Amino acid sequence: SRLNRESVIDAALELLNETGIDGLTTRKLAQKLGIEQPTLYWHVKNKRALLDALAVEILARHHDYSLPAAGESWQSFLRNNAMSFRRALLRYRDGAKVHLGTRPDEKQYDTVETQLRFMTENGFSLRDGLYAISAVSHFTLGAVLEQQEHTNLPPLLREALQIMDSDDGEQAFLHGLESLIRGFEVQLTALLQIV
């Protein structure tokens, strides 16, 4: 079939949904594309470089709230951005494991910069804004990893596992997110007081 960048990524995401990250190989990617392994090698050198590219394209295709709206609060932006990040990660099998370990790509340089300058325009230091941005990322990735990778009790534990089951963990994620944003807001409003 066609082996432009877009078709190779399309095939690899479709294979990812079929096999998961551990089972995704260049050999099964060559099979799905109806080509020999050395043909594929011209286009994609190894599994490392494939996963790096998926990680970037899944966010390019499906993370539609990278940027704040005109006049949006920093609280509302972090909320929307976290929900968008979570959705994009959940959209493919093992999607969070695909994202894990990746550093911003040159193609998202300007996005991450904008996020950080935006927080600095709203009264954060670069440091405090970085802390807030990393805490949202680390909380969101952790939540989606346990959700995806989870794919004679004592009473509380029994009832709790029941509660976590009754939805995907969207409730626990959205509640924790509100707690993190409020804690950031309490820190920011304090200035130099003891808080």
Add this chain to the structure above:
Amino acid sequence: SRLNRESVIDAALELLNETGIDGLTTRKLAQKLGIEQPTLYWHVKNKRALLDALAVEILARHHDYSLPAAGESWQSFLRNNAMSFRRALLRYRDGAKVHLGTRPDEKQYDTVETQLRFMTENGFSLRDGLYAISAVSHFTLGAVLEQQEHTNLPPLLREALQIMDSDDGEQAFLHGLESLIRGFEVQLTALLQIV
């Protein structure tokens, strides 16, 4: 060498530090123990069951703040428990990836129950206490995963990557933790007011 449970786990953690999770196999475990693969098979059926056991023993050996001290605040307990969880996860190469996906073991039933009852004794609903406990776990695992799995910039991004480098991410982790606990405390003190 000796193949009691304790010696097999000792060998497997030492191999884990050598190879990482992806490179850890029952074949290299048999080699390190100076045995044949079918001998090992009697003791440990597969990689799945090995990793499940490591995940539990790393916390049994090295997570020493599973439980609150006599008279400890819920805020102080969650802080200490998060730092202890983080330390235990960092202690082995890919330790967070080993933990990821695991459900409490029967051997830790009574620990997780105690944590949840403790939060309920301090004014949380079972639900709100579960949310707080899962938010700490998801935030801690996310932070340690990016730390472990990370193993012509625009200005803010350049300076920020510099800041995250200057330590392991202990600063960003401890700051985010304070934000999460304060957000939980604001939620809890609100009762039925609009907050």
